[PDB]
Amino acid sequence: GSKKPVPIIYCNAATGKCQRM
Amino acid sequence: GSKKPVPIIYCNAATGKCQRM
């Protein structure tokens, strides 16, 4: 537990996109 | 069964973002 701004995120396997919004 | 360009997507509950890459 260090950072939890948004419960919903979009981080898929090693791809060109990974994080939350 | 109509369109499946990317196996990975990022569509969360009713939010300001939903789709695939």
Curated annotation (Swiss-Prot), chains A, B:
GO CC annotation? extracellular region
Protein location: Secreted
The protein's UniProt keywords, in alphabetical order, are: Antibiotic, Antimicrobial, Disulfide bond, Fungicide, Immunity, Innate immunity, Secreted
Primary location:
secreted
A Gene Ontology biological process annotation? innate immune response
Report disulfide bridges, numbered on this chain.
C11-C18
Its annotated function is as follows: Insect defense peptide with a broad spectrum of activity against Gram-positive and Gram-negative bacteria and fungi. No activity against S.aureus. Stops respiration in bacteria but does not permeabilize their inner membranes.
Domain remarks in the Swiss-Prot or TrEMBL record? Four regions are important for the activity: the C-terminal loop, the last three C-terminal residues, the stretch of seven N-terminal residues and residues 8-9 are necessary for the antifungal activity and dispensable for antibacterial activity.
Write down what this protein is called. Answer: Thanatin
Question: Native species of this protein?
Answer: Podisus maculiventris
Taxonomic classification, please?
A: Eukaryota, Metazoa, Ecdysozoa, Arthropoda, Hexapoda
